[PDB]
């Protein structure tokens, strides 16, 4: 079950590019 | 990415004005008309009292040179000379955007004082009678 | 190396929630 593995990195990828996009609308934001 | 400003410009400008001290010295007219338009933003808001590294630093740069020294350079270097010129000129630029912004503030006397060094820098200007196009157009603006 | 193939997916996945309360306490700090 390596492709688990695979899929776990790509899903966690993902999620910290969402987090990263939300810090910056809420950059913005305070701005 | 963000407006930094209240949690990393305290130490950005001073730790990169340090790094940044060999401006003058490289006289690779790219990176000098870049730095100064960076200090130039980083100076529309500047308001952490660092005016000090930012404006020293143009002062540095505004008594590099104003006419060319060679009297051989026929589009020779003037081209390049202007290209390095230039640098300066938008130095200046900068100068009169950053005192349009500080039309009112505390440290107003900074743009006073280099105000002081525009008039300065003119005074000069026009000392030597210039025979430079691209000067001519700075007297202008 | 399947269970250790679980193994390395419970590993990424405590570290990646791990750093997702970062981000989150980051975002709570701008509200």
């Known amino acids: 079950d390596i492709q688990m593995w695979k899929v776990s990195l790509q899903k966690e990828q993902a999620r910290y590019n969402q987090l990263q996009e939300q810090r910056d609308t809420m950059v913005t934001k305070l701005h | ?141």
Not at chain 2, 23 to 30: A, F, G, L, Q, S
Not at chain 2, 107 to 118: D, F, K, N
């Open chain 2, 1 to 141: 990415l963000l407006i930094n400003r209240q949690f990393y410009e305290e130490e950005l400008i001073n730790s990169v004005v340090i790094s940044q001290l060999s401006h003058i010295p490289e006289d690779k007219d790219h990176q000098v008309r870049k730095l100064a338009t960076q200090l130039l933003v980083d100076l529309a808001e500047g308001c952490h009292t660092h005016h000090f590294n930012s404006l020293l630093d143009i002062i540095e740069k505004v008594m590099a040179r104003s006419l060319s020294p060679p009297p051989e350079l026929e589009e020779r270097d003037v081209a390049a000379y202007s290209a390095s010129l230039e640098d300066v000129k938008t130095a200046v630029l900068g100068l009169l955007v950053i005192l349009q912004t500080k039309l009112y503030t505390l440290p107003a006397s900074h743009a006073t004082r280099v105000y002081e060094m525009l008039v300065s820098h003119i005074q000069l200007h026009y000392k030597h009678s210039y025979t430079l196009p691209i000067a001519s157009s700075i007297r202008l603006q």
